Amino acid sequence: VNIPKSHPRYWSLYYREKIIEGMEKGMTAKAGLIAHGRGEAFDYLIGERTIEPAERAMRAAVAKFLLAEHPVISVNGNVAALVPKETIELAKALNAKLEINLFYRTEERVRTIAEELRKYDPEIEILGINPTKRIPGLEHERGKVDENGIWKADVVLVPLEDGDRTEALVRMGKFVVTVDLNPLSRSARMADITIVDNIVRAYPRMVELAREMKDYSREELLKIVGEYDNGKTLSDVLLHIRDRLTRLAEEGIWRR
């Protein structure tokens, strides 16, 4: 990361280095590198900041998790490369189990990811190591879940997830929250709560909200998670990007 701190693409470049090493540590899938670029472009368009529609979604999600009877947080190759410590934090803050859930499971991937998480907590409870259950509707390898993790969860957080799984989880009766910079992806459109923000900002922001809501009443929380409309939240994100586009055009370098 040898670039002036004043570089406008400072952080973006920094995480791009992180995602590359992720694959270098053998935990980030190649498809994960591609998904990362999808994120980069939408983040650039959005403004690399947590927009209002996102703060809104995170509020409802934290409220929703606080009421969960068995909340679970899913971790994949990208999460492990970008926010390995922050995901352990969010999981402690919401008293939620941690499950390694990969679309493409392998003995190495799981081990490496569990190892990466154990670098910030060698004691934390990590599920999905030995997955016995299956998410209905998915190909055997892609629908693996842990008898004690997602399989029994009522509210689940699946960040940077493939649309088929999000949909399948909703179909099996799980309430699904996702973090996804692409508001037009199947997953973003299928989730009950869609947080359109970079996970590097969303995760510490939610750990914050969980503190700011730690002493909330089950009534206050029910009011929150009760007034949330994911549809209007998605439409606003789209409108935001549209307005962001109008201005990005009247700026930068032009040639004529």
Ligand X SMILES: Nc1ncnc2c1ncn2[C@@H]1O[C@H](CO)[C@@H](O)[C@H]1O
Sequence ranges of the binding site for ATP: 16, 38, 180-182, 186-187, 198-199
Helical (H) or strand (E) element with 187: helix 186-190
| Region of 86-94, 121-129, 177-185, 203-211 interacting with a second copy (CB under 8 A) | 177-185
Residue 192's nearest CA partner among 167, 209, 160, 165 is: 167
What residues contact 233, with CB distance under 8 A and at least 6 apart? 53, 56, 57, 194
Cα 241 to Cα 183: distance, rounded to the nearest angstrom: 10
Residue 191's nearest CA partner among 164, 216, 162, 170 is: 170
Cβ 80 to a second copy shortest distance, Å: 16
The yes or no reply on residue 242 touching a second copy (CB under 8 A) is yes
Nearer to a second copy, 226 or 231 (CB): 231
The answer to whether the CB of 120 falls within 8 A of the CB of 88 is yes
The yes or no reply on residue 175 touching a second copy (CB under 8 A) is no
Tell me which DSSP letter residue 152 carries: G
Cβ 210 to a second copy shortest distance, Å: 25
Cα 42 to Cα 10: distance, rounded to the nearest angstrom: 16
The yes or no reply on residue 231 touching a second copy (CB under 8 A) is yes
Cβ 180 to ligand X shortest distance, Å: 5
CA atoms within 13 A on the CB side of 45: 19
Tell me which DSSP letter residue 69 carries: S
Q: Which residues, 149 to 168, sit near ligand X by CB under 6 A?
A: 160-161
Nearer to a second copy, 21 or 220 (CB): 21
Question: Which residues are annotated as part of the binding site?
Answer: 16, 38, 180-182, 186-187, 198-199
Which of ligand X, a second copy, none lies near 241, with the C-beta cut-off 5 to 8 A by kind?
a second copy
C-alpha Rg value of the chain to the nearest Å: 18
The residue ranges that bind a second copy (CB under 8 A) are: 9, 16, 19-20, 23, 30-31, 33-42, 44-45, 163, 170, 182-186, 189-190, 230-231, 234-236, 238-239, 241-242, 245-246, 248-250, 252-256
